[PDB]
Subunit: 139 residues, 3 copies
């Protein structure tokens, strides 16, 4: 399997807090750790492919966001993980291969990829968490 970077980058951010939550400045995605229940939605990621009639659309996670077939948002200090599941909102079939999430069939797919909490993680340490995904194609 080989991923070819060819596209833009989408960044999913989430600030985890305690019950007493202090929002400073402009609105951003924030949740209390108590809200990090199994399958809790974190946010959608739009995907729009062009010129891929003969390639399999793919998204590659930053090195710090995957390890051992698993994906996760990572804290600013690179220490804490928030495991997630990545799933298209439609019925399309995809595969995971070492940090790469690719579509099973060729074509210029457009769609929404949902990012969901994988397993209850209500003990997550408060902090700023990020998941970075780069567009490209797999073969």
């Amino acid at each position: 399997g080989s991923f070819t970077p060819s596209g833009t980058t989408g960044t999913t951010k989430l600030t985890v807090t305690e019950k007493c939550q202090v929002r400073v400045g402009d609105l951003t995605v924030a949740k209390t750790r108590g809200q990090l229940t199994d399958a809790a939605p974190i946010g959608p990621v739009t995907v729009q492919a062009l010129g891929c009639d003969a390639r399999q659309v793919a998204l590659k996670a930053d090195t710090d966001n995957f390890e051992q077939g698993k994906f996760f948002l990572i804290s600013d200090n690179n220490r804490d993980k928030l495991y997630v599941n990545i799933r298209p909102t439609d019925n399309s079939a995809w595969t995971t291969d070492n940090g790469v999430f690719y579509k099973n069939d060729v074509g210029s797919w457009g769609g929404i990829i949902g990012i969901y909490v994988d397993g209850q993680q209500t003990n997550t340490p408060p902090g700023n968490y990020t998941l970075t995904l780069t567009g490209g194609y797999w073969a």
Copy 2:
């Protein structure tokens, strides 16, 4: 005194220039050094607390933004300071403790924190200055 990070981060930015000022790209907060008079407003910082009925709301400045009971925006190269005063627009009572600005009474406060130039600093070197404040609670 102890601060518990629990909330989002607000960033106050200011570009200081000379009288001949060249604005490139999108509008941003910029002032000539001549405008850095005592009590000159730099910008507001919104604060919205939730779930803090039994905690004292607090904002903690980045390590590089405070020293010796004083707050300041810091240049990109970490060298130059622009001393400021931090004050809520309403009549609420707050206290400063080693980089932490906390509310005297418990409660889920919502309000505006003003950032003002502390003492005339019309000699400030031109550059990009930042003040970073993180939400949480104090005890």
Copy 3:
């Protein structure tokens, strides 16, 4: 010649991709390498000067964006260059001097600076490219 930093910074970004292009997240400026033809427009840069009746308006490129009288966007890893020409949309006369693009006559100029591909570069490696320009004056 001497440039005095005095103003804000404008950042021109461009993501280069292959024909199969996967856009992830919010819209950003992206082009296939095949679109990097000679004189292809990359994007405009607004300039608004104030208080410069007796100074020559100038823009200085980041150190990593110029070398030997030539300007270029640079990849995230600092390795790959995309040579460009910088030109005002109006009929004003400007000069280039070691990374500095300055106006020939004094005055508080307001205008648009166009960034164009300099020579066909359809072999550019896919990646994220940036050109940073800071406002100030020259003498």
